[PDB]
């Protein structure tokens, strides 16, 4: 998982950007720098509590 | 029935206009160039031949240039052509001006020389010395030491044919004629419209001797009044760019401006100043002698009865414009056709003047008073 995480951050489509909001069914909504908003059913590899809206 | 020969000449001319690769070198360039090539701005030049190129997508990757004909023409702000996929500079930069500017250029003038115009001979003299004469005989101006006047304004009441003088200039001009209305700068986008004024002038400089006609200049520049309501016309910015082009730093090279306004008082003082309009031409309503020539020219190519008295119509009614004379001649022909006479009687001309002049009502009680 760590090797995939390193490759994805390095990859061009990582698109790091702020989370618009935090949701629970544990979920997140992220607006990428491309200005496209995506809702992820799983909040992500990083801890949900650690993540801040 | 000589019309058939004339129609054939027109069709043949269109056919002539319609009828207007290296074994290895061209084929190699054809392979090098993509089937689709996208043209984009050049931002930076690098000696390695990989030069940054700006694009609508903004991919500015340094890209190699391999132009067989020449690659030394690259300059900042040049529109380079790039492959759709590789994005390398394909070759010599595309060199075409904006489409709106292309429409203004005129290659054919329908009217002939100053012959059709009658009684504006003083006005013809001024336009010729400013426009036709400097090009035909440049030596006279140099010997005098005078630099030829480059700007003219034609101001007159409606229907004095200020445009006719401009059409006549187009008929006999070495210079490329760009015909742009003053009301053709309504660009909605903020900016763009002042930039279009810059575009028209840059093309004129590119074509070297050029004559610019701006009919109805009242719309582009009037008063330079304050924003007031705060709508902000932005037209004042457009006029200021024209003012800059005519005499605002640098030089105008060899471009001559002809401008026509029904009302000259409204026009802002800065635009109508020596250095932007060195010579000013006034078209007055035709008097008697000028009317005689115009009436003859309009009736020259129509059947005329001996009975008709051209002098009687001109002397009896005073105030009719040169255009009004043409309308009387067209109306008189229609009046005769009603009686099925191709020939035009004096009676027809008398009826015609009355019909054309029915909308012109002027004056109040200023009769007994003075």
């Amino acid at each position: 998982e760590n090797s995939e995480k390193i490759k994805v951050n390095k990859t061009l489509p990582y698109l790091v950007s702020n989370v618009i909001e935090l949701l629970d069914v544990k979920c997140a909504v992220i607006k990428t720098s491309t200005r496209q908003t995506y809702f992820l059913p799983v909040i992500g590899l990083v801890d949900a509590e650690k993540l801040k809206p | 029935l000589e019309r058939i020969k004339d129609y054939l000449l027109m069709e043949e001319e269109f056919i002539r206009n319609q009828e207007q690769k290296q074994e290895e070198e061209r084929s190699k360039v054809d392979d090098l160039r993509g089937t689709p090539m996208s043209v984009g701005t050049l931002e930076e030049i690098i000696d390695d031949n990989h030069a940054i190129v700006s694009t609508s997508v903004g991919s500015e990757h340094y890209v190699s240039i391999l132009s067989f004909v020449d690659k030394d023409l690259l300059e900042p702000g040049c529109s380079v052509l790039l492959n759709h996929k590789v994005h390398a500079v394909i070759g010599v930069l595309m060199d075409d001006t904006d489409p709106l500017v292309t429409v203004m250029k005129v290659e054919k003038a329908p009217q002939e020389t100053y012959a059709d115009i009658g009684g504006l001979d003083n006005q013809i003299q001024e336009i010729k010395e400013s426009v036709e004469l400097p090009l035909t005989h440049p030596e006279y101006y140099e010997e005098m030491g005078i630099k030829p006047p480059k700007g003219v304004i034609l101001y007159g009441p409606p229907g004095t044919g200020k445009t006719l003088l401009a059409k006549a200039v187009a008929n006999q001009t070495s210079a490329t004629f760009l015909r742009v209305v003053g009301s053709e700068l309504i660009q909605k986008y903020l900016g763009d419209g002042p930039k279009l004024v810059r575009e028209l002038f840059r093309v004129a400089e590119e074509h070297a001797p050029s004559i610019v006609f701006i009919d109805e200049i009242d719309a582009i520049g009037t008063k330079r009044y304050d924003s007031n309501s705060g709508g902000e016309r932005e037209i004042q910015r457009t006029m200021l760019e024209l003012l800059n082009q005519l005499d605002g730093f640098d030089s105008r090279g060899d471009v001559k401006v002809i401008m026509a306004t029904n009302r000259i008082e409204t026009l802002d003082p800065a635009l109508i100043r020596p250095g932007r309009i060195d010579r000013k031409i006034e078209f007055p309503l035709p008097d008697e002698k000028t009317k005689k020539r115009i009436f003859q020219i309009h009736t020259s190519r129509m059947t005329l009865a001996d009975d008709v008295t051209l002098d009687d119509l001109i002397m009896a009614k005073d105030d009719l414009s040169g255009a009004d004379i043409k309308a009387i001649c067209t109306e008189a022909g229609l009046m005769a056709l009603r009686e099925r006479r191709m020939k035009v009687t004096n009676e027809d001309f008398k009826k015609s003047k009355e019909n054309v002049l029915y909308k012109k009502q002027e004056g109040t009680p200023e009769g007994l008073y003075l």
Binding site: - | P36, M37, S38, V39, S56, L81, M94, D96, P99, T102
Partner: protein, 51 residues
């Protein structure tokens, strides 16, 4: 008659082909090259078809 109707459906295999972009020609140059601006993109030099 049945062959004709099924052949029309075989003709409908054409609907699958992707539509060509619609663009306005800014100007034309010689050697089968035209300058056409794409409707949402930028100027493209294109190779004219034989037709």
């Amino acid at each position: 008659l049945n062959a004709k109707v099924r052949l029309l459906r075989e003709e409908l295999q054409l609907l699958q082909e992707q539509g060509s972009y619609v663009g306005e020609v800014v100007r034309a140059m010689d050697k089968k090259k035209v300058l056409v601006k794409v409707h949402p993109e930028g100027k493209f030099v294109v190779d004219v078809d034989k037709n």
